[PDB]
Structures are given as structure tokens and as C-alpha cells.
């Protein structure tokens, strides 16, 4: 029953996947944050 249950769906391992998804989302955000101007004339530093 265990083998077949893990053969049927991914959703049960959502507890280990959401740890992986939280680090992926935190780093993708930390990249997107470089898009911000913080009120300077430019986001990109060479354009200063």
C-alpha cells in the first residue's frame, strides 16, 4: 500500500518540497530586489 501510495502522487512529499521551494523563492526574490531604484536615478549601477 505504501509503495503504490508513493507511486500514485507527489502531493504527500509536499513537506520536503516546500522547504526546497522556500529557499528557491527567497533567492529569486533576493535577485528581483536588485531591480529596485531605492529612489536613486537608476537601478543599474554603471548608469550612475
Amino acid at each position: 500500500k505504501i509503495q503504490d501510495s508513493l507511486s500514485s502522487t507527489a502531493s504527500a512529499l509536499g513537506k520536503l518540497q516546500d522547504v526546497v521551494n522556500h529557499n528557491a523563492q527567497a533567492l529569486n526574490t533576493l535577485v528581483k530586489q536588485l531591480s529596485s531604484k531605492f529612489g536613486a536615478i537608476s537601478s543599474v549601477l554603471n548608469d550612475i
Binding site: 526574490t29 528581483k32 530586489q33 531591480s35 529596485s36 529612489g39
Partner: protein, 49 residues
Amino acid sequence: DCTMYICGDSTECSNLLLQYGSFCTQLKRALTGIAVEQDKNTQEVFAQV
């Protein structure tokens, strides 16, 4: 509402806040992560039967 907290009733301040952007979403998600956990806690404690 990060926008109504930071910027009281101003479209212009809402334009300025948009140069910061993803900060507001990161705070909203972080508070949503807590809000979901309160229900999980209550379910794990009481819904054992």
C-alpha cells in the same frame, strides 16, 4: 495593507513605493505564512480524533 500603512490615502506615495516593490510582497507573504500556521497549530492540537 502595506500601502495604506506606509502611504496614507495617496496615489503619489503609491507611485513612490512602487520603486521599492518586492519588499511589500515579501512582508505580506511572511505575515500570511504565520496566519496559515495558526490554523495548523490548532488542528494539530485539537483535531486528533
